[PDB]
Amino acid sequence: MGPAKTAPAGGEVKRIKLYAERLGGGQMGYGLEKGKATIPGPLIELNEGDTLHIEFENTMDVPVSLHVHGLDYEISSDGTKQSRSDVEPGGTRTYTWRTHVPGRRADGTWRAGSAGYWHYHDHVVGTEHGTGGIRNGLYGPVIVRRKGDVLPDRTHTIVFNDMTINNRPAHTGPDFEATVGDRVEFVMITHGEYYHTFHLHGHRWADNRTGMLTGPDDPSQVIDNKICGPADSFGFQVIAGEGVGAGAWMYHCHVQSHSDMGMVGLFLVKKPDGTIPGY
Amino acid sequence: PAKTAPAGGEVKRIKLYAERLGGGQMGYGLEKGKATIPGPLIELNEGDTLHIEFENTMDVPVSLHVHGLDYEISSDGTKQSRSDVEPGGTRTYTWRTHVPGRRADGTWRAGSAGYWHYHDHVVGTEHGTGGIRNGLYGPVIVRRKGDVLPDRTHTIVFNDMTINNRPAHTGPDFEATVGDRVEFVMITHGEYYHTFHLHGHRWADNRTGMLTGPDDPSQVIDNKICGPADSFGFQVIAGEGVGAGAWMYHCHVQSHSDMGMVGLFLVKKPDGTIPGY
Amino acid sequence: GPAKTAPAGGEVKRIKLYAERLGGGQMGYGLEKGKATIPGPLIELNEGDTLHIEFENTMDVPVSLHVHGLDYEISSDGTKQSRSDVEPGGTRTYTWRTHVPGRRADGTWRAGSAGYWHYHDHVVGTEHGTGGIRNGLYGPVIVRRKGDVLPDRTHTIVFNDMTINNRPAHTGPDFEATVGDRVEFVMITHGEYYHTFHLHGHRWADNRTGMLTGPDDPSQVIDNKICGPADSFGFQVIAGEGVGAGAWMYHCHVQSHSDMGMVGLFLVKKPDGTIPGY
Ligand SMILES: [Cu+2]
Ligand SMILES: [Cu+2]
Ligand SMILES: [Cu+2]
Ligand SMILES: [Cu+2]
Ligand SMILES: [Cu+2]
Ligand SMILES: [Cu+2]
Ligand SMILES: [Cu+2]
Ligand SMILES: [Cu+2]
Ligand SMILES: [Cu+2]
Ligand SMILES: [Cu+2]
Ligand SMILES: [Cu+2]
Ligand SMILES: [Cu+2]
């Protein structure tokens, strides 16, 4: 275990493509290429100061939109019908997201930077709030890193969408694998009608911007359990198995009927030899 | 720039009336026939004392209960403490506030500063379920010396399934000009949890809703879960980095969105116009 | 006089714990047979302490001990999948450890174990402990950091589904203090529902200790807090500070919940023992 890799300064202009596609069984998803849509959608990362142009195409037969949390966008990128920012069937649009660093305002106040654990999702499918689109799966993680932020080995996204994790059948996970000592990042997003409490066995994080204590000064409560509600996003990083060891470490919503009905997954933490004790 | 709050400590006095409004609604007001939902904004600087000369203008008992401020049990505003007000009655409710400081035990005593609220504790039940439903609630802000002052303050209450007891899809909308420093007080009441969301803007989840400086670890959010009696606030620079537009705020619980808990933060260009609206 | 503070930890400690049936379908944890309570006994450790829990299952159904926030190996997870439950009549030793904060090799700052936590059954009735938790097997755990301020008294309030501590509606509990006492509350939530915890006449910081660290701590100061199953938090107040003696209500603020009896009293006495208006 050596010194942490950290995020560099941003400010570069970046470009991707995104498609909205019908998937099997009435689901809909975002993808970086036609035929490539996933639920959750592709993870988008940026460094504070980066600009992102998303060349967007709706391949479906209903209007769809891309709406993002926390980042800078003009009203023309709001991704709503009210702002005439949605996309007709077979149409395209360029959505532009911007980000900025923190800094002293001319009025003496300190302007918060864009950095955080955020998300994007449809605002027009089935209702003008994207209720149907979100149900069907159009949602995905966005991470904006501040310069100096600690980088993980792997990032995993867990979305509680109504009664499902990542729109999966009950009791299907997903499961994520790590090796003891790995620095693992989780993005935790909630959607739909219901409140949840996210819980992770054998690990804990700080309730704050990065999910990690900035040092001894940081008062933030340290927690393994966090209540969340539709459109909430937070994130954190743990050292897999730290002080605990290898094992199949459950994560799950802690609402009792929710865990019983199956919103449950495994953080599978292997010994260096690839074996998991007691699993 | 950035006007700030002065040091507190004055003794202050206001009149407050509970009154019936249209259709089974009830509200607090600063003058008879002037009641509003939400009630009048009460602002204090830490150390201030507030004497409230309270008159119940209605035909049923009512009370005034406040969160976070200093009050003796006789100002609790409950039946249980015999602090409520009979129909037609008057009472003086007293709220006090204090600054932070070191205690004799060595700990750090938190001051009164923050985003708080008041509301009835006796109407319809001994928890004020009927009164709160009917609209007796209002915002209270206590400022610490040095706190940044806004240009305008707006109160948004999620009360059960309504915003400020309005009919669905009625707003309210609030207007601003790009660059204005705008304060929001966000209160929740009733039966249900909600998630408050504002397009195009973000705030720090902390006492003032703003980062204190480069060392403040607080998560920066546009979406916040809230339950009955939850109280928070923040300030934004209107349109900062995003420009003008009709910027939606709304509950993010999907059916609540769909059922009309929605409003607009209307941010005008200097010329008074809103793009896309 | 200066507050008492928590000492450095690092001792190896040991206790016995029993799971046992109580009246009317209730189940509880206890320090001695016949002694089970709901909530179960308070367990208090200093960071670095190790705790060996010598556990006996007194009941006819398998039961388990699962804990939040503390370090434990998978063999102390307390779940069926890890084969850490305890057969009826059986015994097992569960081991919880704790650690202090400090720098990692990678240069980051490792969070310590300190906090307000809880333990409960993971096993009875479903493999999430739904029956067990409903029956009352849950309890508070506090892990203190060296230097943390210590109270005169600690009280545990658990919102479990629609009850406070599995008590009948409108039964409290009520807690007594004298004006000026330093009183600690551990607030835990279990079951199916979100709640909001509210305390009249007092307030705390929403943060690790429930108290502001000093003039630079940004944490919101609150009298009202939303919580959901398995959330835990705690705080300490000076009873009656700036307010005075009185019967100070606490309750869930969801209106139907308070109307239906999730309510209790923080009874703050004058030094002579009397409470005004009560
Ligand atoms: Cu929206
Ligand atoms: Cu859930
Ligand atoms: Cu657990
Ligand atoms: Cu959203
Ligand atoms: Cu109350
Ligand atoms: Cu809502
Ligand atoms: Cu949004
Ligand atoms: Cu209240
Ligand atoms: Cu579990
Ligand atoms: Cu409740
Ligand atoms: Cu209250
Ligand atoms: Cu648990």
Residues of B in contact with C150 (CB under 8 A): none
**Contact, A55 vs A99, CB < 8 A?**
no
Interface-testing mutation among B215, B226, B249, B252, with chain A (most A C-beta atoms within 10 A): B252
B132: Cβ contacts below 8 Å, ≥ 6 apart: B119, B120, B123, B159, B189, B190, C255
Supply B55's token pair: 């008159």
Return the closest-CA partner of residue C46 out of C13, C2, C95. Answer: C13
Residues of B in contact with C258 (CB under 8 A): 127
The domain defined by B148-277 folds into: Immunoglobulin-like (2.60.40)
* C 134-153 near B (Cβ less than 8 A): 149
B62: Cβ contacts below 8 Å, ≥ 6 apart: B18, B26, B56, B84, B85, B120, B122, B123, B131, B136
What element of type H or E holds A134? helix A131-136
CA distance C243 to chain B (A): 5
Residues of A in contact with C233 (CB under 8 A): 221
CA of residue C78 to ligand 9 center, whole Å: 9
What DSSP string describes C20-69? EE-STT-EEEESSTT--BSS---EEEETT-EEEEEEEE-SSS-B--EESS
**Contact, C148 vs C209, CB < 8 A?**
yes
CATH code, residues A1-149: 2.60.40.420
Angle at B133 between CA B128 and CA B134, to 5 degrees: 100
Residues of C in contact with A247 (CB under 8 A): 73-74, 77, 82
The domain defined by C1-148 folds into: Immunoglobulin-like (2.60.40)
Q: How far apart are the C-alpha atoms of B77 and B115, rounded to whole Å?
A: 19
Residues of C in contact with A196 (CB under 8 A): 228
Q: How far apart are the C-alpha atoms of C261 and A13, rounded to whole Å?
A: 58
Could you give the residue ranges of the DSSP H alpha helices within chain B?
Answer: 129-134, 254-258
**Contact, A230 vs A196, CB < 8 A?**
no
Q: How far apart are the C-alpha atoms of A1 and A5, rounded to whole Å?
A: 11
Where are chain B's structural domains?
1-147, 148-277
- What's at B16, amino acid-wise? L
CATH 1.50.40.10 fits B1-147, yes or no: no
As beta bridge partners, residue A117 has: A143
* Sole residue written with tokens 């179960």: C40
User: How many other C-beta atoms can be found within 10 angstroms of the C-beta atom of residue C55?
Assistant: 21
Distance set, CA A102 to CA A113, A233, C216 (Å) = 4, 20, 19
Could you give the residue ranges of the DSSP H alpha helices within chain C?
Answer: 130-135, 255-259
Angle at A55 between CA A52 and CA A61, to 5 degrees: 135
- Strand B245-251 relative to strand B220-221: parallel, antiparallel, unpaired? unpaired
Residue A218, chain B, CB below 8 Å: the answer is yes
CATH code, residues C149-278: 2.60.40.420
CATH 2.60.40.420 fits A150-279, yes or no: yes
Supply C40's token pair: 């179960």
Residues of C in contact with B227 (CB under 8 A): 194-196, 224, 226, 253-254
CB under 5 Å of ion ligand 12: residues: C 230
Distance set, CA A43 to CA A53, A118, A144, A187 (Å) = 15, 10, 11, 10
Supply C247's token pair: 């019967």
Cβ burial B47-84 (10 Å sphere, 16+ → b, else e): bbbbebebbbbbeebbbbbbbbbbbbbbbbbbbbbebb
Please tell me if the domain spanning A1-149 has the same topology as the one spanning A150-279.
Answer: yes
Return the closest-CA partner of residue B276 out of B196, B188, B199, B189. Answer: B199
- Strand B162-163 relative to strand B194-198: parallel, antiparallel, unpaired? unpaired
Return the closest-CA partner of residue B122 out of A77, A109, C255, C60. Answer: C255
* C 106-135 near A (Cβ less than 8 A): 106-112, 114-115, 126, 128, 130, 133-134
Distance set, CA A23 to CA A35, A121, A142 (Å) = 9, 16, 22
Q: How far apart are the C-alpha atoms of C154 and C172, rounded to whole Å?
A: 16
Residues of C in contact with B205 (CB under 8 A): 220
A221 closest CB neighbour out of C101, C108, C115: C115
Return the closest-CA partner of residue C120 out of C12, C19, C192, C32. Answer: C19
- Smallest CA–CA distance from C81 into chain A, residue: A279
- For this entry, resolution in Å reads 2.3
From the number of C-beta atoms within 10 Å of its C-beta (0-12, 13-18, 19+), residue C126 rates as: middle
Interface contact flag, B74 C245, Cβ < 8 Å: no
Q: How far apart are the C-alpha atoms of B247 and B264, rounded to whole Å?
A: 6
Identify the sign of the CA torsion C22, C28, C33, C34: negative
Interface contact flag, C194 A195, Cβ < 8 Å: yes
Interface contact flag, B225 C223, Cβ < 8 Å: no
A229 closest CB neighbour out of B148, B193, B199: B193
Q: What share of chain C is helix, strand, coil (3-state, %, to 5)?
A: 5, 40, 55
CA of residue C260 to ligand 2 center, whole Å: 24
Distance set, CA C256 to CA B159, B160, B225, C260 (Å) = 14, 12, 19, 6
Q: Edge-to-edge, what's the strand order for the sheet holding A264-270? A: A175-179, A264-270, A247-253, A196-200, A225-228
* Sole residue written with tokens 């980042």: A71
Residue C231, chain A, CB below 8 Å: the answer is yes
**Contact, C93 vs C124, CB < 8 A?**
no
Interface contact flag, B223 A214, Cβ < 8 Å: no
- Solving technique: X-ray
Angle at A165 between CA A162 and CA A170, to 5 degrees: 90
Supply C146's token pair: 């060296």
CA distance A184 to chain B (A): 20
Q: How far apart are the C-alpha atoms of A219 and C84, rounded to whole Å?
A: 34
Return the closest-CA partner of residue A10 out of A101, A119, A73. Answer: A101
Could you give the residue ranges of the DSSP H alpha helices within B112-210?
Answer: 129-134
Supply A150's token pair: 């600690």
What DSSP string describes B21-58? -GGG-EEEESSTT--BSS---EEEETT-EEEEEEEE-S
C182: Cβ contacts below 8 Å, ≥ 6 apart: B105, C3, C149, C150, C151, C152, C236, C237, C238, C239
**Contact, A124 vs A130, CB < 8 A?**
yes
**Contact, A72 vs B241, CB < 8 A?**
yes
Interface contact flag, C101 A277, Cβ < 8 Å: no
